[PDB]
């Protein structure tokens, strides 16, 4: 025995990769056969399952998250001026997939807006999204590739890899304490 390749921990659920211990743990974080965890902000929920199962999980356990059909919508976040750590979530359905639209006000204050595909990293690469804030002869735009829920959004948000704005920018675009984000999804 010159050396040995070890199977990925998720080999049981179908990973055929075999690797030397050195880069086993490296593969096992990237591995696509890794179960999906709950993609809602606030991890009061600790559900796991297969990708097929996720949409149903949200449909049963997160009924208050609501969905819109369209490749162009307006995500109207209400009570934008609420103090402290706030979340806004909704779902956008188009091109046969479901996307999670997230806004996060963090405490210091700063807002972060980002879109994730309910799908795989490879699938996420087929899509682009635009976020845009609008006011009288004023527009702020963000354009990026959506993250797979597999990857999540937490590190993106930490790295400011998304639309970022502060409370004062919010006031240039907010009407009656509500902010309208124009979300547009497309293929590429």
């Amino acid at each position: 025995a010159n050396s040995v390749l070890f199977p990925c921990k998720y080999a049981s659920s179908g990973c055929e990769i075999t690797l030397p211990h050195t880069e086993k743990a490296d593969h096992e974080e990237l591995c696509e056969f890794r179960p999906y965890s709950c993609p809602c902000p606030g991890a009061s929920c600790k559900w796991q399952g297969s990708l097929d199962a996720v949409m149903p999980h949200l449909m049963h356990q997160h009924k208050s998250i609501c969905t819109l059909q369209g490749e162009d919508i307006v995500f109207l976040a209400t009570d934008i001026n609420l103090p402290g750590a706030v979340d806004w979530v909704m779902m956008q359905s188009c091109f046969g997939f479901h996307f999670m639209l997230v806004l996060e006000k963090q405490e210091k204050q700063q807002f972060f807006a980002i879109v994730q595909l309910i799908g795989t990293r490879k699938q996420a690469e087929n899509f682009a999204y635009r976020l845009e804030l609008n006011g009288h002869r004023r527009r702020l735009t963000w354009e990026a590739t959506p993250r797979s829920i597999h990857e999540g959004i937490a590190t993106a948000i930490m790295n400011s890899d998304c639309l970022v704005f502060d409370t004062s920018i919010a006031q240039l675009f907010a009407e009656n304490g509500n902010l309208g984000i124009n979300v547009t999804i497309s293929m590429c």
Binding site: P41, G42, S64, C66, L68, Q69, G70, D72, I73, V74, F75, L76, A77, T78, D79, L82, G84, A85, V86, D87, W88, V89, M90, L103, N178, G180, N182
Partner: peptide, 13 residues
């Protein structure tokens, strides 16, 4: 474009 508007209610952590 033809744009459906959806109102999203906040959740405080």
């Amino acid at each position: 474009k033809l744009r459906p508007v959806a109102m999203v209610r906040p959740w405080v952590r």
